[PDB]
Curated annotation (Swiss-Prot), chain C:
Hexadecamer of 4 heterotetramers, each composed of alpha, beta, gamma, and delta subunits. Alpha (PHKA1 or PHKA2) and beta (PHKB) are regulatory subunits, gamma (PHKG1 or PHKG2) is the catalytic subunit, and delta is calmodulin. Belongs to the phosphorylase b kinase regulatory chain family. It comes from Homo sapiens. Phosphorylase b kinase catalyzes the phosphorylation of serine in certain substrates, including troponin I. The alpha chain may bind calmodulin. It is found in: Cell membrane. It comes from the Eukaryota. This is Phosphorylase b kinase regulatory subunit alpha, skeletal muscle isoform. Muscle specific. Isoform 1 is predominant in vastus lateralis muscle. Isoform 2 predominates slightly in heart, and it predominates clearly in the other tissues tested. It is linked to Glycogen storage disease 9D: A metabolic disorder characterized by slowly progressive, predominantly distal muscle weakness and atrophy. Clinical features include exercise intolerance with early fatigability, pain, cramps and occasionally myoglobinuria. Although the final Cys may be farnesylated, the terminal tripeptide is probably not removed, and the C-terminus is not methylated.
From Swiss-Prot, chain E:
It comes from the Eukaryota. This is Phosphorylase b kinase regulatory subunit beta. It is found in: Cell membrane. Phosphorylase b kinase catalyzes the phosphorylation of serine in certain substrates, including troponin I. The beta chain acts as a regulatory unit and modulates the activity of the holoenzyme in response to phosphorylation. The gene is PHKB.
Length: 1033, 262, 88, 262, 234
């Protein structure tokens, strides 16, 4: 090996010039998908890699002073594609504005373009253009090339579009997409899903592009890109939630490999990285490459090329015959070099060589995929990995896989140590176990295992009367006026300032959409127009919802926000969490709890979060303070001075709903004057807005603001009846609800919003705030408007629990809040006894929260097992692994399972699903959805458990006929009935109550009754002898 | 410590250019419209209209010792690069036209003088306008050479090198080819009669003398990026101007467009 | 501001006379673990403030501080300390 | 893009401050001589004369969004810390003298108001000059506290923490001690009689109150760096302040130095 | 080993505060060579290494958020020592100039100073003060600490003085000195020899000092020090 380094790079010089740089589009700089055939199609994602391949060789070409001009040819080969990629997106800047406001498949940036003009080729109907990775990979690569010194962004107008490109990528945590393989899922029905590979890339893209100057070394404060920390965090939360699964339909996908490595390295958790990794390695590795995913029908022998969609049952025909992609070996080879283990480079090089092809000139060719011939699909299905596969691309045919060709150049250079990993990844994305001090990248000063962040908390009082009153009890609250350099702003105020970020009228982009700023954003310190700004978190706002005025709720809203900042805030400086105390907090008995948290806040630890209590001037002196120059680069120094926080200088309802709603006469208006309750006029003025128009006038004025003034009055004086009708008949929404439903649904927890016994809407995939508004109020509930107000309460409370106590919502596939209200109200009937129970519409939100915690706790306490079965059954709490076990029950049962008029067959269920599959869980719930009586349902699941603990231990007994659990349930009850009749002869007939209070496990437990039932029915069939286990008799 | 008075007067100059020329630069492709009434972009007006942007960029780069001065110099220089590369897209989207005009010097195989300022496309057909203007492409090539010598990196690939050479052959026969000229009207009669106007031939000679042995990635270049110009056509151009001057064409005793040549 | 006063008795027998007068007070033992000391102990413990033997600084000289000093509530080695005013 | 006009006026103030105050800033010690004739540096003249640099630095840090603005603000704040650390070194070179003043409230144990600007040393002996000016150290401590509260890290270690605390100890007894005062001449007669001057004790009250419960390490500090002030001494200072105002001392019907305390 | 890493760092904090930081001079920040004896001997190189140790402890403590002020305490103790060395040198700045124009063992900066006053203590005849390892190590530790965030150089006049120190250092290839051991050589004749240690330290200082903004991130063009390329090459 005496060749000069000129020689080895010339070896790689050829390959790129002959196999990738020959086919680069001279006009748009793009890289066509099909090298031969005359196709104009160029994809966003693959074209990014092709430029990076020349970039990788370009960095290798930086090591020679005598490059004969090769370095600039390969450096600007990347720039030509990225600028052409950049050029394509503006061409669609109208779509970018639409996707920013309303994320949808029909408003997104496109993914395929004319290679020779850059014009749009396929419409939304023809092609699924929602591919977040392509936009995210662009932003991740764009900073990656700019950091190395390439100049792609040329003027401030491109800065605004890339800034707006961040605003689109900021919302990928909740917008589903078709993903890398433009299919969406394994079913290929055109239905969009959330993918970890797509979501992870945006997190990596936002991490690198945050604060990055698009102008490189030649840049100033007007060329930095600002990334919403909250939007990145919500995307970060989704990525760990979905993983190790790529999507709902995908248990594991080999497309996760770019997600956990080159280009993203988006996972900062090694363990997860390991668990994500093996499921890719174990389930998708093959001799000829990595299969895209299990049951992938892309370019398979059993797939009709004409149809653009796959039949729901066609999926099982793709099992064991998935095409193996050699490119994913090249991905692994880079992984070996980057993370320092050398074998992984060699073992995945030894697999790449046999599947590698060559041109006429000897230049190696990376095939796209290897497909098993239709002549051998049966043999391949029987024994996978034993039949030869034919390459999609072989060379000498005119077809080359440029994305694979690009990775080949990158991987070999790192393997040959012609590019060091630090050069090819300039904005560290792979950080070794030495994981400290990376902005937005989970590595704070403490590192990857310590999270004892000390959060800077400043106490701000609403009024001067308050701060003296708080001082008299030992709490030291500064006040707004006291701090002139420091101007305190509402979180909605930072939005207006942020509508000016990325504004360009020339391309017609409006900037950052009007959105609430989360805890992480409000945690920073800001400079707008030269005035120092500190924003108190949105959890102190009294407009979004009516749960914020309750001190006990505000007591925990501070607590979980403090926990949220402590664990997610991984920036350089310490966050600022301003606290704001209003008069309504102190007045009444509400002073007692707020003082204690203030006192514990003084101590230095709250909610397990270390805090630093001091004056706002002291707490801001040297921290890294966020710069708001875009409000000044447009010369808007005379922008209106943003409105800082300003210092301020008893019976049950005697009127029943049915009593006067049924009353026909319109005299009820006189009753409004006759009645004196605050909750009353919440209704009379509420029906007034419906009965005689929206903006009718009365004694005080237009009725529209009276309901609002009542709600303002009601919330402060804490008669929570009126504050619920007032908040219902005015149709208000909390902005925190919109991504609450997203958070539940990305955990696999299906959300439905409809009252018990009324129409319920299934939210399978997440929707936008506009859509959920009509579902909350208009279409779902019309019997009572106040149903939404209580409905809107828990979905914030559920969001609180799912974060603080994730385990508490385990076992339930779906959180039906409407049934939770029925569960919520029914337990009070048990709690109240022979007394008119407390109304759920009368309790304060903390009581609703504490009620929610009490009855959704684990071991329900002191409940006759009847009440446990009511709570658990109405709550749809299923045992851990219940869905797994019924699959096993469904596996060795010929005639499936019948539950109260539904039929769960063995086929096509077994062929179309997997034992861990998420889709199967819905079907069994659909099978059990008809159980009207909740304790019957819990009896059904234990019976379903009972056969499971029966069947798996007892592998010889199989069903012969259909399994109707109702017959299994009753026969257990009658044989139950005879024994207790033998004891005391209970005269109640057809009453399940004696069965429900019976404990599952005990002397004569419900399980013991149930297994006898399942023992007999199994015993009425053939006892199959095992080949594995010989029989002694 | 403080910015020099050159810097402040340059900031005034930058506000002038922003308000006048650069605020109509179409962000998507970097081109400029003619007016609010005529929305399309001429390649000649585009190449010339960024001369002020170029001068601002070089003037700022001379005193670019601070982050903001460096960044504004970068913005001006790369706005210039944006416009000339957008015009490169416009020209390369008619590569068949360049190839045809190389052999058969007809007016129907010529690069359009105007392009869609929004999509790098041809708004009008090959016959709805007088498109063959061998001084507009000439000024484009001459300024491309001048920018590459002053360090601006406009072209990015060897395909761009080959297209620039085929443009060289496009402008090579400008001395023997009749064109509608700087005023898009041919002769004095304004009847679609293309004529050999001296401005086109002179700008052709200027570009050809500019693009000789000029490495077109700049100092970070090699033999593959040398633009090769035969001095035979250059000297034929000079001879034709000598025969023409002070006349600009056979039909015109003198045209002020010769200020773009002298 | 309003001034809090904790009326205290040395022994149970002085507490009984006050109780006979309808006065509810605690002893030096009932106030425990809160520990009550005179102002001279305050002046002494405050002399360890700013001490640096290498810099030959030995803290504050013994100075009497008025009712302002004894009316603050002190924590010395995680123990609540109250010092009585010097006019007694 | 360009610097704000406020920045223009602030560089104007920069030239003014540079040519008046900061041009005499002694390099080695950071101190400021009174004049070319008086080549010694007083504590009070230095502390009051560095205020301009503080104000200019804080003004720049308000608009510190560009690198050179950061540089100017840093220059001024660190010139402030330079002067104040030079003065701290001058005081701490005389630690035995503060120690003697702590228990002996004598005029012979008082820190010299003037020091050698070139070596942080003593120019004249303890008896050649009137050195007890409890309003020079008072303003020094007050502005030390205010710069620590404003982001300036002046003290650098716990030894300086105890020295500043023992200097509060040096100043806590200003109410019950006669000093030669702001004008270095004692009483009205100017005959070596030290008198209780209102400006001195008011400056002492300000230093005691402002520095009370303050982290000399700044925000990034701990319990070892908080310097504790008893409210009793500062309120005695306040009491004899009202009892003696509107006069300046027993022999002084009025002084314009009371402007420093009101 | 379940010891929390705070206890691990508190161990070394103890060691530093008891054995190293207990002896720092309040007036100059220098660390005396003799801990006991009343000797005012303060070596520049000795104090430089002491400040380096304190700075290393501060870098360690930087990883814990609830530091109780220890990161600042150690960082600024190191800054205090580094600034005391600077003060001692700008007290001799006339010798800085006269060494710049003409290097000589009787024209050099002193390598030892009074720990409690910062003034010169041993004259040229008594002690061999030409130790390039002192000023070179000063520049190296200065650039190391400013890069780590220790804000040491304060105004442009300190910038000029440090640059003149670079001017003195650039000449070391032709300046024979007494070395880190202040003895000159084995024979102990007070003779000056060229030492590899001193020239290497000066080369490292020139490499790091070159193009270094003494103001850290908080600086502009007027705080960057320029180093003669040829001088460093030689
Ligand atoms: C050898 C296999 C045989 C004999 C199948 C019949 C056996 C049973 C029926 C008993 C199975 C029940 C239990 C193991 C609990």
């Amino acid at each position: 090996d005496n060749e000069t380094l000129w020689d080895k790079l010339d070896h790689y010089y050829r390959i790129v010039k002959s196999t990738l740089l020959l086919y680069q589009s001279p006009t748009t700089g793009l890289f066509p998908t099909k090298t031969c055939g005359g196709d104009q199609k160029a994809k966003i994602q693959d074209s990014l890699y092709c430029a990076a391949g020349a970039w990788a060789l370009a960095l290798a070409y930086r090591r020679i002073d005598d490059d004969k001009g090769r370095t600039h040819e390969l450096e600007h080969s990347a720039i030509k594609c990225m600028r052409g990629i950049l050029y394509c997106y503006m061409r669609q800047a109208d779509k970018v504005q639409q996707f920013k406001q309303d994320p949808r498949p029909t408003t997104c940036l496109h993914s395929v373009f004319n290679v020779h003009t850059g014009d749009e080729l396929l419409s939304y109907e023809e092609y699924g253009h929602l591919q977040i990775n392509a936009v995210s990979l662009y932003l991740l690569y764009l900073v990656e090339m700019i950091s190395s010194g390439l100049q792609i962004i040329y003027n401030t107008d491109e800065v605004s579009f890339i800034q707006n490109l961040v605003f689109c990528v900021e919302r990928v945590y909740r917008v589903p997409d078709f993903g890398v393989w433009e299919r969406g899922s394994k079913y290929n029905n055109g239905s969009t899903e959330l993918h970890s590979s797509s979501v992870g890339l945006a997190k990596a893209a936002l991490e690198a592009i945050n604060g990055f100057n698009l102008f490189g070394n030649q840049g100033c404060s007007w060329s930095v890109i600002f990334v919403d920390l909250d939007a990145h965090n919500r995307n970060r939360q989704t990525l760990c939630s979905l993983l190790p699964r790529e999507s709902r339909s995908h248990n594991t996908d080999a497309a996760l490999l770019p997600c956990i490595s080159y280009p993203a390295f988006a996972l900062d958790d090694e363990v997860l990285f390991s668990q994500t990794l093996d499921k890719v390695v174990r389930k998708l590795k093959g001799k000829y490459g990595f299969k895209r995913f299990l049951r992938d029908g892309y370019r398979t022998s059993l797939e009709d090329p004409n149809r653009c969609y796959y039949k729901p049952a066609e999926i099982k025909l793709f099992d064991g015959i998935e095409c193996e992609f050699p490119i994913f070996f090249l991905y692994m080879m880079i992984d070996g070099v980057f993370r320092g283990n050398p074998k992984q480079v060699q073992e995945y090089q030894d697999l790449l060589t046999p599947v590698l092809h060559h041109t006429t000139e000897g230049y190696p060719v990376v095939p796209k995929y290897y497909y098993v011939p239709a002549d051998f699909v049966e043999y391949e299905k029987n024994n996978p990995g034993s039949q030869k596969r034919f390459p999609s691309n072989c060379g000498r045919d005119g077809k080359l896989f440029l994305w694979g060709q690009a990775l080949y150049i990158i991987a070999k250079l790192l393997a040959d140590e012609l590019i060091s990993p630090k050069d090819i990844d300039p904005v560290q994305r792979y950080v070794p176990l030495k994981d400290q001090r990376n902005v937005s990248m989970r590595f704070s000063n403490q590192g990857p295992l310590e999270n004892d962040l000390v959060v800077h908390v400043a106490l701000i009082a609403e009024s001067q009367r308050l701060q003296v009153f708080l001082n008299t009890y030992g709490i030291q609250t500064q006040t707004p006026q006291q701090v002139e350099p420091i101007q305190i702003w509402p979180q909605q105020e930072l939005v207006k300032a942020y509508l000016q970020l990325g504004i360009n009228e020339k391309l017609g982009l409006s900037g950052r959409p009007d959105r609430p700023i989360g805890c992480l954003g409000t945690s920073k310190i800001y400079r707008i127009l030269g005035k120092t700004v500190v924003c108190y978190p949105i959890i102190f706002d009294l407009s979004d919802f009516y749960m914020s005025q309750d001190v006990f709720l505000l007591i925990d809203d501070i607590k979980n926000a403090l926990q949220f900042i402590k664990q997610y805030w991984k920036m350089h400086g310490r966050p600022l969490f301003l606290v704001l105390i209003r008069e309504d907090n102190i007045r009444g008995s509400r002073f007692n709890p707020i003082l204690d948290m203030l006192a514990a806040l003084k101590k230095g630890i709250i909610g397990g979060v270390k805090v630093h209590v001091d004056r706002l001037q002291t707490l801001i002196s040297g921290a890294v303070v966020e710069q708001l120059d875009f409000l000044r680069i447009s010369d808007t120094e005379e922008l209106p001075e943003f409105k800082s926080f300003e210092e301020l200088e008893g019976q049950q309802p005697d009127v029943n709903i049915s009593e006067w709603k049924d009353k026909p006469t319109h005299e009820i208006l006189q009753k409004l004057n006759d009645c004196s309750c605050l909750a009353s006029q919440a209704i009379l003025l509420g029906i007034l807005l419906k009965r005689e128009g929206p903006n009718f006038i009365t004694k005080e004025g237009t009725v529209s603001d009276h309901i609002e003034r009542v709600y303002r009055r009601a919330g402060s004086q804490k008669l929570w009846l009126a504050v619920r009708y007032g908040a219902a008949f005015t149709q208000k929404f909390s902005s925190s609800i919109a991504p609450h439903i997203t958070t539940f649904l990305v955990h696999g927890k299906q959300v439905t919003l409809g009252a018990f016994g009324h129409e319920e809407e299934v939210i399978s995939n997440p929707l936008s705030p506009r859509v959920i508004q009509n579902i909350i109020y208009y279409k779902c509930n019309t019997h009572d408007e106040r149903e939404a107000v209580i409905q809107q309460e828990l979905v914030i409370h559920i969001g609180w629990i799912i974060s603080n106590n994730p385990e508490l919502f385990s076992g339930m596939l779906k959180i039906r809040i409407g049934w939770i209200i029925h569960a919520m109200e029914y337990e009070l009937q048990i709690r109240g006894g022979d007394k008119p129970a407390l109304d759920l519409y009368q309790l304060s939100p903390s009581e609703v929260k504490q009620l929610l915690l009490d009855i959704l706790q684990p071991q329900q306490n002191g409940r006759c097992w009847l009440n446990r079965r009511q709570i658990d059954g109405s709550l749809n709490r299923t045992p851990t692994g219940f869905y797994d076990r019924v699959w096993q029950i469904l596996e060795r049962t010929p005639n499936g399972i019948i539950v109260a008029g539904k039929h769960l067959p063995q086929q096509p269920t077994l062929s179309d699903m997997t034992m861990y599959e998420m889709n199967f869980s819905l079907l069994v719930e659909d099978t059990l959805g008809n159980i009207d009586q909740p304790q019957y349902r819990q009896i059904v699941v234990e019976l379903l458990m009972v056969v499971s603990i029966v069947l798996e231990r007892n592998p010889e007994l199989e069903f012969q006929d259909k399994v109707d659990l109702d017959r299994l349930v009753k026969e257990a009850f009658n044989e139950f009935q005879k024994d207790q009749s033998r004891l005391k002869e209970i005269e109640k007939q057809d009453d399940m109550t004696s069965f429900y209070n019976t404990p599952p496990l005990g002397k004569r437990g419900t399980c013991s009754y149930l297994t006898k039932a399942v023992m007999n029915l199994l015993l009425e069939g053939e006892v199959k002898p095992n080949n594995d286990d010989p029989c002694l008799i | 410590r403080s910015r020099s008075n050159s810097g402040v007067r340059l900031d005034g100059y930058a506000r002038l250019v922003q308000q006048t020329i650069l605020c109509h630069q179409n962000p998507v492709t970097g081109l400029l419209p003619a007016s609010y009434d005529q929305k399309d972009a001429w390649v000649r007006d585009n190449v010339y209209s960024i001369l002020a942007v170029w001068g601002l960029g070089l003037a700022y780069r001379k005193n670019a010792d601070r982050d903001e001065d460096k960044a504004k110099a970068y913005e001006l220089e790369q706005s210039v690069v944006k416009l000339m590369r957008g015009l490169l897209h416009c020209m390369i989207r008619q590569v068949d036209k360049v190839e045809s005009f190389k052999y058969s010097q007809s007016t129907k195989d010529s690069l359009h003088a105007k392009y869609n300022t929004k999509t790098c496309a041809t708004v009008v057909g090959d016959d709805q306008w007088g498109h063959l203007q061998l001084d507009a492409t000439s000024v484009y090539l001459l300024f491309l050479a001048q920018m590459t010598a002053s360090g601006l990196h406009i072209i990015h690939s060897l395909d761009e090198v080959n297209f620039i050479q085929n443009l060289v052959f496009y402008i090579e026969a400008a001395y023997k080819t009749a064109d509608f000229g700087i005023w898009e009207r041919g002769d004095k009669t304004n009847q679609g009669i293309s004529e050999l106007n001296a401005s086109s031939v002179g700008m052709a000679k200027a570009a050809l003398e500019a693009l000789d042995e000029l490495d077109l990635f700049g100092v970070k270049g090699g033999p593959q990026s040398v633009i090769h110009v035969l001095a035979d056509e250059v000297q034929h151009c000079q001879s034709i101007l000598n025969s023409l001057l002070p006349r600009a064409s056979t039909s015109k005793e003198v045209d002020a467009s010769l200020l773009s040549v002298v | 501001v309003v001034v809090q006063v904790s009326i205290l008795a040395e022994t149970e027998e002085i507490k009984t006379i006050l109780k006979d007068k309808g006065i509810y007070v605690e002893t030096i033992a009932e106030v425990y673990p809160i520990r009550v000391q005179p102002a001279r102990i305050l002046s002494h413990i405050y002399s360890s403030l700013g001490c640096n033997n290498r810099m030959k600084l030995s803290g504050r000289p013994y100075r009497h501080m008025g009712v302002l000093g004894t009316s603050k509530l002190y924590d010395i080695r995680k123990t609540i300390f109250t010092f009585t005013p010097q006019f007694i």
